[model samples]
Target: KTHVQLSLPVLQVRDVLVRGFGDSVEEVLSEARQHLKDGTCGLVEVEKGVLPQLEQPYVFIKRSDAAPHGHVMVELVAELEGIQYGRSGETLGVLVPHVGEIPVAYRKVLLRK
Candidate 1:
């Protein structure tokens, strides 16, 4: 029998929203593109309701490249495993900031597989 244990930081889904850099989709896409220029950038939005579930370590990526008319361009990322297992609330605690850093370790693991 073989058991492989992995130690990874957990991330929580704080919030998910379609935020715009400006009032229009063009403006939003313009800013989103600039922000993602350094890397793939995204955001999260949380609504008031029952606690969210975390089945695995995943991220929700949204892009504004082909935004619909009258819609703002934005990206959303949510960490279910961390958020689901850690805490439940309207606002995220220290765990929120850790989301960005946590994915690096997982990325390596996924690439190896």
Candidate 2:
């Protein structure tokens, strides 16, 4: 049997900074969590800028809710590092791609239509 180790991070929606967006961040995050749990999520990769020396691998989650009457957008960004050879020589100077969304509770992807 082959063992595949997967790492998933689940966190409550709070204290996220969304430019030009208001307090509804939590609501979108909540919906994102629901989508994640329901297995209806998506993933995309973001690249790094000109600063290679100060650059690092990071992961971000953006959630948007179009609830008919109103709308909300929330974004969560985190810096990732120190995980053995899992990220060694794997394009550290630039951002990495999304391995793909998983079907786990408290996680989800943004579905823009």
Candidate 3:
């Protein structure tokens, strides 16, 4: 038997999922692009009820200028093979020192592929 070694930012999803910030995929992607400024980024969004079944969600982000020709890959694995842990209800906001009025939902919760 042989096992293929995957790269960093790997996530495993089972049944229990997490809530998403954006209303659509494009909105989530856009939010990701802002935070994950590498040009290449990944995100995983699952139903809040499906979170318990999920083991761990993988995440990956890379810069377009970074080698490999501006390619980005995001994946959500729906299985539990190893010890995975994550918390839900994480707020998305930017904190600026002495800056009044933080943007609304300016952050996103994403996992690497």
Candidate 4:
């Protein structure tokens, strides 16, 4: 894997297992989208009790045009054996930047390479 494999605008894909199969994936997407719609975004009203299990790698690709912007956003996929990245999903200690949500920049290139 590349060093900067997970580049800027880290699009997070929460591995949620609320029961069922592929259809449950649909529900997860919809539920997440609903939460995004209900509030601005970030730390949604999801499974608080089982939060630890939600930690899964960024194991997906909704490519072409649907990439995340510079700021934070609720992105989505992925499964069991697929996660083999170096960094832990939630280990990148992202503090709560309490700004109201907005979407614009394609990615942040300000980091030192």
lDDT of 2 by residue, 21-104 (tens): 112334434443444345433332324433233223333344333222222233343333542212121221111222242322
Q: Note the Cα lDDT for every prediction shown.
A: 0.30, 0.29, 0.28, 0.28
The segments of candidate 4 whose C-alpha lies over 4 angstroms from its true place after superposition are 1-23, 44-52, 55-74, 78-113
Best by lDDT: 1
- Candidate order (lDDT): 1, 2, 4, 3
- Please give the clash total of every predicted structure, in order: 7, 1, 24, 0
Off by over 4 Å in 3: 1-8, 15-21, 38-113
TM-score of each: 0.26, 0.26, 0.24, 0.28
lDDT of 3 by residue, 3-73 (tens): 11122222223211332324333444454434344423223333464344422222213221111222232
lDDT tens digits by residue: candidate 1, 1-103 = 1211122232334332222233333443444344434333333333453134312233333332332333323232334335422222233111122214334
Runs with alpha carbons beyond 4 Å of true place in candidate 2: 1-23, 48-113
- Residue pairs in collision within model 2: 36-107
In model 3, state the lDDT of residue 28.
Answer: 46
> Whose lDDT is higher: candidate 1's or candidate 3's?
1
Worst 10 residues of 3 by lDDT: 91-100
RMSD (CA, Å), candidate 1 to true, equals: 16.0
Q: Which wins on lDDT, candidate 3 or candidate 4?
A: 4
Worst 10-residue lDDT window, candidate 4: 89-98
